[model samples]
Target: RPSWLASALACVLIFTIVVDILGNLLVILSVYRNKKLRNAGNIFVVSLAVANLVVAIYPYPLVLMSIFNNGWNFGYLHCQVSAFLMGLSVIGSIWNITGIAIDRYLYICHSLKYDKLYSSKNSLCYVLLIWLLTLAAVLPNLRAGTLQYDPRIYSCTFAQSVSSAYTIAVVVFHFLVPMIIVIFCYLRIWILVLQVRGIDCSFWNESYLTGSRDERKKSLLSKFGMDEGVTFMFIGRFDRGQKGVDVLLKAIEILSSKKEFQEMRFIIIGKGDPELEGWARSLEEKHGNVKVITEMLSREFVRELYGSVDFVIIPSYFEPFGLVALEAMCLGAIPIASAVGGLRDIITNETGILVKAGDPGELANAILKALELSRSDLSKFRENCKKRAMSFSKLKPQDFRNFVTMFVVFVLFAICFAPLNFIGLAVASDPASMVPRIPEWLFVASYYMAYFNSCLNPIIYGLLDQNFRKEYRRIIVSLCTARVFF
Candidate 1:
């Protein structure tokens, strides 16, 4: 038997160890096996899993032994090694958290640069560096520890005096520095997001000025010093592709009939099918502004092209995120888009004009509005569009619900294991007295609670996020029935 406190401490430690191991393993599995979770963001998740595994498995057993025995029973070498491993894993976990912050910052704050920055090679290198640094920081403790069996207590830890310096260094290196980095990086990201949002507000004003009921608004365009000649961009079938020939031909026909587009230049960046050549030739013959080119350009180049244009026409039947609209908005180009799918969510009246999909008359009328707007009004609309785009921008929520939830579990585990340490300390301190009085059931309960928290996280994810549930179910089904035997 052991003291109540000792028994309780032992239970807590055991519970925490079990839960942390299992929880981290599931996190890793969920991230790795699920196809939907295999994006670049999951790289940091895998690194975290590795760190959690180290934390859960490496030091707890030694802790348990030391508590029960009261002094160094693991011998000098093991004691020293355990302390080093503990420090290493703890530091590693902090680094993983830092990596996750950086990854999210890149994605939400510097979205355009995320693809370039978070490539597979860059992620791997970061992970490697984190591990190397963690090991280096903990190496000092591994060399200085000398475990001695205490008659009063049996388990091993570094000489308490020597361990003090190690503890302080570990705390600063692992806890302090990483926390600062996370805070500073996220703050910078927030500032950039606000700046972008300000640009969106300016674009909103531009939209209103251009769409004003006043007929004299056109004269104000010169005062704002906006562009003179109207820029037209086609966003449907490339001239080289046969997929959208009928639609492209119809659009060209509408243009041919339009009196307003006679002087406006049509810049076609993508190719259309050979079959559309006759249609294009007719437009070019009828209007000098009609031009068709067949080449695919990068996103940056496309944005620049849109930037030069006063307005972009997206006559798509369907669009998902409407990358084209986003690109156009980023370039300060007013969008005249079809009202469908996610495009409706993006191109609002305040930002861009929306027209009925597949309606040439509606498209023509939308273009006519752009032509009528003065340079000043057009600039206002451009600024308004940018401002609107910023409001719709994505950012990481500052809510600490997830951290609080995890930390609560952490504290509970600490409490559960509290008895273990108490009992173990009592037994090692004085094997003859109250140390032998503690019961076994308390330890068992603590162990169970530890396991409970570890497995609980996956259930939490399943319940809270539908996407996580779908991906988990899909992976389970695939893994269960990968091969069929008759």
Candidate 2:
């Protein structure tokens, strides 16, 4: 009583419905229950899940029914309503996916107040408007079509005038517009991700200069830690303190000469440096109480080294996200840091001491002041420092696997199914044809699958990937602008 095509479609329709419904439900549950999932990015995910569920469940079954029945079902009124709802749901799903792509684009590239620009309330309103407008677009098709019962097939169907304008509009609005937006947005995001990777590489490699050195110097100066104008004089022909090594040499001389410093503890751990070796020898010769730790220390020894010291000296002229400060804080070591990039973000008066860049006297003074603090007060400060470190601890990456799995599945489906669908359609059309060609509808379905791709990306970034979330937050902080209201 039905075409083989209809039966084939029914199988695919059932698979789409089951998988889409189950997948979307899991997304909804995970997002709703997890507090960590509550963010601007996840809001788009909820909207997309709702849209996909509507498309996969309602419209698909109706299409299968139509193939068997040979026309519209029930009455003329039901025909209009079903067609309108189906079109609305299909278009709405694509539009929501487009919205997701745009949201990710803005997050990755543009500067905007994310909290204000894409709140939960705003996301709901946007999704509602998209569906409502899609429904409006489908309303014209409802009035243009009438239901008819075919006695030969014993099925209900729509009798309608085939308007070229309506066909063109359907192709343009549902397929063309959303496809353009999705492809362009993904292209831009890919480029940006590549650029970010490039920047990350530059940080590790010494040869590449992203003008990072100048930026680091300027950032250091802004934090009240370094005056580049003063530091330049030392290396210049007229100024006595040009090299950082020379400054350390003068500080060692002053410290070793002091009778009060002879009995106190001192240690240095880093790359094997001739100046550092000379400085340690000078201190040992005069004070005899100093300890020199020069070899590449193990993690446990590094921890122990921090724990044993009253003051941890980080004599870096340019430090970004100072790993030394982080290690020291973990072990309750009071850090005496040269005011530099991320060092300013860490070291404060309550936590540790900061010194002017390239100032050895200031460095020695900070060490001595740390030593001056009573053991009880020092213990309390160390505990406070460890507490501060905990603020950055929870940002980790085990969560993003759900979205990653979906992406991998989608890619695999496209690879496997696209060719099979094409070959099946071709064989059905021409049994002897070696070259398989997919039907137009199957191509349309593939396009629809492309629209679905946008929905999972935001979830992958926000829920599962810790580094992505951290970088996204940093981008937001660096770019977001707001208007003040009284």
Candidate 3:
């Protein structure tokens, strides 16, 4: 008769298999029913769930049956097919994790280009490639008659009977490579989070210059032009009075008074109010340094202009979040903006100079200070500008929170699979007989724990991810009330 431990282990395996089936089904069905959960990133989650479901339905049942009988009664054909499916499921799951990591990296670091890079067509191609690579990796062993049912594990899997070289290759390709990629991606994500947190505060104070000041100034001058004196660029809609062109005009008048500032140029690139255009023309007529381009420039040309200018001036009286400031900061141009709305948040003393809103005198003084700055000081400001712009590119708070949820999911995946993986590695290294003595029940229990991972992901999603939980509850409520709600 089987020992009580054996019977208990068998019960655990059965329960794990049941949980795996139901949990993965819930994950798949919830994602399928909820339109909101059908994003490119969620698509990868669904793919992983499907892979787990395949394990629960096909391989795990066969594993349980072998445990109950204490051997593989299934024929050679069944053994080969079962091993193939198991390999496919495990390898597919590993690669899916890597895929999700890549998806998150794009969503967080390159959010502006995410839609273009991770299009539905590209996502589909990625999924197809994952499965195809799995097949290519698995088919080799099956054709060589190496992968078969092993009595040691009491299930069809890569066995000690396979050559050491093949076993090592499989381990490295399927597990090691994917693990390295996941770690690398997440490490980069962690570093980005820290940098964002460090630079979260607005640059209101100017105490010390950044260490790379001289280096930064030299780099900007080399790229844009050394001959261009202190040129200020203003690009915006011509809103009379509100656009602060009058203040800019006054600042110009103030600058024109100084012999040192005679070479200062103010280039306005925009078109709007006729009166504003007329004012711009009057300034252009009076001061040869003042130039107004009313025609809209192409994005490429605007980018070129941004690089050429030393300072971007946004002296609006009632500015909200100014994209112009962000655009200018991104191109290494220091912003000399009025202290208002979003402008206050973007321009810090370290990154740029901010003056009182609508005060042309203060702006003119700020401009004078900018002009007096040594090349080293200008470089420091440029360095801060680039650093601040990079902070914006990192994930937002809500976006990073979403990423944390993904991180938790990956942690669950690791916890569930890692032990079984180590055990499998041990088994692969030597005959089951040569391995250190361990309880057969313990081995079976570990395998069941790995199976339990498939089930745990749905639970993880329900607990940690709000959207998934909301959809899960909706699905349950609909079923309970006999009504459709998605």
> What are the Cα lDDT values of the candidates?
0.58, 0.52, 0.72
* Candidate 2, lDDT over the whole model: 0.52
- For model 1, how does the per-residue alpha-carbon lDDT over 270-292 read when each residue is reduced to its tens digit? 55556566666666666656666
Taking all chains together, each candidate's TM-score versus the true structure is: 0.47, 0.42, 0.60
What would the TM-score be for candidate 3 when compared with the true structure? Answer: 0.60
For model 2, give the 10-residue run with minimal summed lDDT: 229-238
Pick by TM-score: which candidate is best?
3
Best by lDDT: 3
Error of 1 at 73 (Å): 2.2
State the lDDT of candidate 3 residue by residue for 1-486, as single tens digits: 256755665676677678767777778888788776767667788788888778777777787788779888878888888888877877888888889888877665554323343444478779989989988988888777777775645688776435666766776777778888888788667655554444422332122224343444344445543334677788888875687877886777777778867757677888878987888888888776677889877866666566657888888988645667776776678998888766775676678888888787899888888788776887778778877776665435534666787778777777777766666566677755535554665676666566666667777788887878898888777878864579
Question: Candidate 3 at residue 477, lDDT?
Answer: 78
Clashing residue pairs found in predicted model 2: 71-156, 71-157, 72-156, 72-157, 72-158, 234-241, 234-242, 235-242, 399-464, 400-464
Off by over 4 Å in 1: 112-121, 146-168, 188-205, 210-486
- State residue 463's C-alpha deviation in candidate 2, in Å: 14
Candidate 2 segments whose C-alpha is farther than 4 A from its true place: 1-5, 55-59, 62-73, 110-121, 146-161, 200-486
